[PDB]
Amino acid sequence: HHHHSSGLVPRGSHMSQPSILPKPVSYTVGSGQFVLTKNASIFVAGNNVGETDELFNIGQALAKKLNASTGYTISVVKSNQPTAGSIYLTTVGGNAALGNEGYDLITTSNQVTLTANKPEGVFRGNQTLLQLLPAGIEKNTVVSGVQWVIPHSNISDKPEYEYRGLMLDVARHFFTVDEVKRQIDLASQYKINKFHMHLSDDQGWRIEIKSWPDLIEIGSKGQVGGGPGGYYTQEQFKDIVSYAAERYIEVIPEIDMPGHTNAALASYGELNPDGKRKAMRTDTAVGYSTLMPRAEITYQFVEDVISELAAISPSPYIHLGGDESNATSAADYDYFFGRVTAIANSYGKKVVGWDPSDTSSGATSDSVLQNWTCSASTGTAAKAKGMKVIVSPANAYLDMKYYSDSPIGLQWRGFVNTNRAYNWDPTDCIKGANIYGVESTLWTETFVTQDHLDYMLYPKLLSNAEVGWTARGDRNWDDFKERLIEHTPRLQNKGIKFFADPIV
Ligand SMILES: CC1=N[C@@H]2[C@@H](O)[C@H](O)[C@@H](CO)O[C@@H]2S1
């Protein structure tokens, strides 16, 4: 048999007919079709009144999306007797084998029926439902001239990995609450279920800490290149968390330590050995900053920050960073990370950290490793300790240029086009581990606008999202590439300023 790899498409990028992404476990089509009309209602039914109430909220979110493009006013009804032309969302009789996030989605001529184990699974299944309707449905304004049809079809689905995440760096360049909400919303449509916020680094501190007000008053006032920066009040952070929660997305906040701490060091002189504030940094260098690993003031500061953040962040996890502590000795790093893990645990939070934080003697088997280095020795400690691992290889570093000539992005991991972002497996990063899942990381050294985010995340994130959801045995670039071409109008309709990658 003959085989080949993909080259660029001759003559440039290519960028009734559903386009489901990520690819579901099974999808069959039969004869006939369902028509969504102005008379349609969404019926919801759970196993008890409380579950029906949660399903009702999910139905209302769906109705809002459908109403925006159809111009209809679909309403939501608490009843297990759907009428002809209805969409029906239920958890009664879910197939337990599909887990919390799995669902069956069956479309007949008279009815759309989504059956799941949990409300979460009906939410994920609704992302598929939106992809079965014609392109146009994802418009934010009324579309005329399109019959709103769904083919007679049968889908069953569930994720391969539990953790399917996106990290946004808001320290290097700041993005508004609206901009952040929009990226969460877009990611949710591709079944991303985790959002990691890199809230602090050398060039800025982005979270209000009432006990240390100069973190904002001084530490938030810049960014890479010297723009004005910005920050989130605690109320704005809670608002983001609440918005994510409506999409069944866990928000994991990161306060990076003991390295990548210049902004804190520029806010409070007492955090530095000579008692003087550091100058703010607007360059892109890394590795040079450190908290004082043997000063009690350091641990007081960390405990105050953790206390306030834990109070407003319901996730059982806090990310304490731990990357590129090149101004911290190995002995001091071991000690520091063990101490801050104890502080986090005392506030009821488990710790996530970049490699090499798993090597800390103070880590527990409840700690999580985010393995970005993905070398043979990375996560040896994590594996021995029974720690879950989130993988972020080169292929998930979405801030990398697509090509040598990309107008934005970095290239210290090489270039990452849409193909590279697809053609990998979590076991390529680390073998013999408990892989919790995957996280796409969007660092923002070179991204200043919403259009820059869109351009780098789309279509790259779609590739990573399929790697997280779809089983390896069912992943194939030639398949995905053709499905992506078909999906392109939907990206356009959503207002995403995506890159038309010539490999697609
Ligand atoms: C972990 C990591 N720490 C660094 C980040 O601070 C940079 O922003 C990123 C840019 O790609 O490179 C490595 S990844």
From TrEMBL:
It is an enzyme of class 3 (hydrolase). Its EC number is 3.2.1.52. This is Beta-hexosaminidase. It comes from the Bacteria.
